[PDB]
């Protein structure tokens, strides 16, 4: 359904949403055809990223659901991420004009900062010397903000995020002098194998919403995710409250973000599977399940992006 919740800025984010990336190897067309069938199915909450190399490809999807009158823009909740390479003060804006223009969008209902460890700017998103290693920039996150912030001022963003911030960051643009606009959510790894509880709590304190990303368990990309990591959707009691419920561990996983206050997204190129994980509305979990999900926590992080660890930026070295 299009229940939503109410942004710290007074717009409405529908509490599930649909994830747009996919692995390199997935060709880019894959994205127009799922985005496309989602909007059918019921999202209305997208996210993307200028990182996922589709929003052309989202944006073309949008465009041709409110072309044949489906939808309007202002039922679409569209999110787009700036990337590591256009921290700078003076790439903020550019990069977010540069998402609009593959968009053709007029404006992104949500942008965020994606990542808070800054390299080299350039057309290259992951630029690399010759031993292999990242080429690190060193940005002040807080005037990286600002310049974020006056992409609201410029109506560009509807409201404005971030991404993979701990608390310690959170607290950095929170307690910014000149601070003109809370991030409305920080949007993190959330599952019930990491299910960010200390982090959670943090950010309803502060009037921030938790967005879950990797909800499923991640698309577990090599060389980005362990292998050997456990695999969520194979959980035991996940599947046997599936069973009970006459669901999946996908829709129970699903259904306990959104019975503890998180928005959560979810990530499906397969139809069928699109079409499944909107049924996260029609059934409701007992308060003693919940509590056996929540027993679930293993203090497994799928998306370390340890390729980026060194820098103090590097947000996972703290506990939370
Ligand atoms: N740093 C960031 O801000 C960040 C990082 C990671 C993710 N995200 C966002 O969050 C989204 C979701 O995270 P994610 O991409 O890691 O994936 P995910 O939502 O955790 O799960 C995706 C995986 O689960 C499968 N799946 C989906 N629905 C299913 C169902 N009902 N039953 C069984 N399997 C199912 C997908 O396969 P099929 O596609 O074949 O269904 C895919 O293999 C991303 O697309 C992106 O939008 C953001
Ligand atoms: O799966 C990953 C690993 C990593 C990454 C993905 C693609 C890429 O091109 C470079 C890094 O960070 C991410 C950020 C995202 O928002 C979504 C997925 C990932």
């Not at 359904?1 to 747009?20: A, E, I, R, S």
């Not at 290693?133 to 995020?161: P, R």
């Not at 368990?217 to 069973?243: F, M, T, Y």
Request: include cysteine; hydrophobic fraction near 35%; glycine fraction near 4%.
């Amino acid at each position: 359904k299009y229940q939503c919740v109410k942004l710290n800025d007074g717009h409405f984010m529908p509490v599930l949403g649909f994830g747009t990336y996919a692995p390199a190897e997935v060709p880019k067309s894959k994205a127009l055809e799922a985005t496309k069938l989602a909007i059918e199915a019921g999202f209305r909450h997208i996210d993307s990223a200028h990182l996922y190399n589709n929003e052309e490809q989202v944006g073309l999807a949008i465009r041709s659901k409110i072309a044949d009158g489906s939808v309007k823009r202002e039922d679409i909740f569209y999110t787009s991420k700036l990337w590591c390479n256009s921290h700078r003060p003076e790439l903020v804006r550019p990069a977010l004009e540069r998402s609009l223009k593959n968009l053709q969008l007029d404006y992104v209902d949500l942008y965020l900062i994606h990542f808070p460890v800054s390299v080299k700017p350039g057309e290259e998103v992951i630029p690399k010397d010759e031993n292999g290693k990242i080429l690190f920039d060193t940005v002040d996150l807080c005037a990286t903000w600002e310049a974020v912030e006056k992409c609201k001022d410029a109506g560009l963003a509807k409201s404005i995020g971030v991404s993979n911030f701990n608390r310690r960051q959170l607290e950095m643009i929170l307690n910014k002098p000149g601070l003109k606009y809370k991030p409305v959510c920080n949007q993190v790894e959330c599952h019930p194998y990491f299910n960010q509880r200390k982090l959670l709590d943090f950010c309803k304190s502060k009037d921030i919403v938790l967005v879950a990303y990797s909800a499923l368990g991640s698309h577990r990309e090599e060389p980005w995710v362990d292998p050997n990591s456990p695999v969520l959707l194979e959980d035991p009691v996940l599947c046997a409250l599936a069973k009970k419920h006459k669901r999946t561990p996908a829709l129970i996983a699903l259904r306990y973000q959104l019975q503890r206050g998180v928005v959560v997204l979810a990530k499906s190129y397969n139809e069928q599977r699109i079409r499944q994980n909107v049924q996260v509305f029609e059934f409701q979990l007992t308060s003693e399940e919940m509590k056996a999900i929540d027993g679930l926590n293993r203090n497994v992080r799928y998306l370390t992006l340890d390729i980026f660890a060194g820098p103090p930026n590097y947000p996972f070295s703290d506990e939370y």
